[PDB]
Amino acid sequence: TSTGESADPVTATVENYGGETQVQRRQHTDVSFILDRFVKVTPKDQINVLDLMQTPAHTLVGALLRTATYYFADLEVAVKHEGNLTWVPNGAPETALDNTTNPTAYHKAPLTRLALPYTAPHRVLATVYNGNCKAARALPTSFNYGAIKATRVTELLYRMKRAETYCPRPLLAIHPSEARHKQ
Amino acid sequence: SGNTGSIINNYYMQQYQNSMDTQLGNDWFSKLASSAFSGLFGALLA
Amino acid sequence: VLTQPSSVSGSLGQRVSITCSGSSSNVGNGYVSWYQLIPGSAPRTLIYGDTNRASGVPDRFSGSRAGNTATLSISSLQAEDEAEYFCASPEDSSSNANFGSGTTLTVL
Amino acid sequence: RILTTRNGHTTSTTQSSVGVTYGYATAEDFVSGPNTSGLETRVVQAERFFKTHLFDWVTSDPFGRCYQLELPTDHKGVYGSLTDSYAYMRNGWDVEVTAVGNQFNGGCLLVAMVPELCSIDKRGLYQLTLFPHQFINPRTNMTAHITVPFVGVNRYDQYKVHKPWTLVVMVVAPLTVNTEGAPQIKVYANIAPTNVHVAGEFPSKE
């Protein structure tokens, strides 16, 4: 069979050989739905830029998002801060924070949640960038959803809603020394 | 849609809830798979 | 490189000024001093630090600094003012302090 | 199954071919939005192929080595001028790789049109085939005719700082010569822009 070598998807699906195909109901694999889990991200004290790809690669989101170059995530943060945190939209100046005229939230225990409209001015944000010489590099300072200033931010979190991703890029798994990797 | 399906919708309006969207004037990796060639490329005996 | 005048005039009791044109490589990162270099005699401190002076020195001739060019004023011109007034800067292009040839300070 | 492509005034026929593949889309998306105020002007004299030289596939080239090329490759003639005249240009690419073979050599060289790569760590290489690709086995087709429409974070881009498409060639199977096969075939790319657009004009050089 096959021999097309045209890289156009070909799959027998166990029909080849007298076997019926019990139905495959793929859920827990929509990028609209597997990409909506609060992922703890290392807070950077008082002023940590709030943006995608800050999260370590290993976390579920932090890795199943690098699978896609461009995402449109309508982010919604959840923070656990010690003074009144003051969000700020994209393009706001560094001294922009502490004005309070910006969206802030006073302290309500245990923690305070927010929605963050997609402010960054692009069609869609990009996970990787080219022509610039890694999350801390090879990408424009503009792909972010503001800055979340605080007296102390203890456990920052990012949740993505209605994110449809584009143009997939390869993932990777933990390379085991021996086969049948035991965990 | 995503991980949020509620019968009572949302107390706030759509504009304040999510970003709004625009248009001008479909997906590709769920049509590439659906357009995959299947079966056998030659006459099958037995 | 520094550039400093070599032809100045003046009379007794009236002020003449000296100008020390420099570049970013040398003028910025350090002091601007002036000394009494009587031709054929030794020089001694008269202004160094652009703000402060030592003990036992007269303040008759005021020096200053502003921008990238140094300037001093020669108040109450006298006959002991008949000597060269050198200047310098730290020329960081070779991590050394470029000095200046002093001007013939005549008295009329 | 010969396939005679054509762009502008530059026909490029093949005697062996496998068939055109496509990437991420078949028809390019809309061209004018709020990004440029119709200050867009199409271009129809800048879609002619231009050759280029990638590398020299040789029997000592182990798996993994990939010589990647980044478009537009600073063209000298047409599409070299569109480059220094207009600040923003958007195009979709038509790229065909032609590794000459004696038909007795099998290397399974693979091409891809991966958008915006940086540092595959030799773990993503095994999965590189995810992007559009046709891999050429000299047991079969001596060419591979990809095509991709311009994908980017903006309507239009500046091709001085943000080069979206990089051609990638990977040797899956080191070349294997026997007296019957070329001791080492070279690989060359007919990279050809298509559906160009420009907007805004630089001032002259003087």
Place this chain on the structure above:
Amino acid sequence: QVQLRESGPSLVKPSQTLSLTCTASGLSLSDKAVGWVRRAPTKALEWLGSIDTGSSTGYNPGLKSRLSITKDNSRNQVSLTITSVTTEDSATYYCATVHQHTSEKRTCPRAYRPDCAARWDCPGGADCGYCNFGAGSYGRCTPFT
């Protein structure tokens, strides 16, 4: 008022080991370094090297082949050597005293600030972060001088 004094040979033949000396018996050249310059005849100003008290020399490379200098602290006299002299080299000995020392470091290039890094997990030698997270200028935390 620090004391300074110069002495040297006044009647000299060119193209020899010319060795002037100078004296500084005060603090203006005890913590700070010795001066050696002269004025070009009917020309623009001159330069000759200097040394700090730690024997750290620095000269102009154009004539480095002919310049070398050493220093002393007890007699309050400092050495000098000008070899391979040509007729064009002649002036008066002046400005034995050096009034400066150097410093080169600069930071916060453009709109960046070094202290505001580790906000973007900055990776590499560059330690200067981008201060206002708005339009891109150098991207994120490109290294300064």
Place this chain on the structure above:
Amino acid sequence: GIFPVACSDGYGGLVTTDPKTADPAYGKVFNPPRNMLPGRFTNFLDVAEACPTFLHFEGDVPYVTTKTDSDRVLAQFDLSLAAKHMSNTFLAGLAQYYTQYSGTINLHFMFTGPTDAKARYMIAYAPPGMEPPKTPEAAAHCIHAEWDTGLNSKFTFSIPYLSAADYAYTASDAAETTNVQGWVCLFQITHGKADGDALVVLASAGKDFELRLPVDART
């Protein structure tokens, strides 16, 4: 019988943007008829379009002189809303609070010189990437408009908006690496017997210039 409910943690906090409305201390209070106000303005952009504002050129005046020399550049300023040549205008004084703007920016030139003399000015736009031009016929290739000044004087070039992203940034560092929004020009190819006459410019929001993302920063 008691209705059950679970109070979410962090669901409710006093966010300083108030989508929710308050509790009323006084149930009933009547204020005098505020209608038919002399002149009302719905949004600031309508006010910005309705009245043109001046720009601040060198020497702290709104007018650009008529230079008489081999140099033909009069005022060549960055297009970002915070440049020195707009620091004065109402449009800048507004966009300073918002962050992202889009669309045209109407520049109004009007010649105020005596009818004794007339001279031609040629605005020119130049998109980013290459250093701004230096002389007429150098910036000619770049989109530009020339105009004499005869019967009537006010001419209104409309600086277009074409940028990589769909929205540009209102506030960005302008110290070094120019700004990326773009350059503009007021090149004067000719001028006959008219040094006294002096140009005055006026900025305004164009047919569409609808800014977003309010952030009350320091001002």
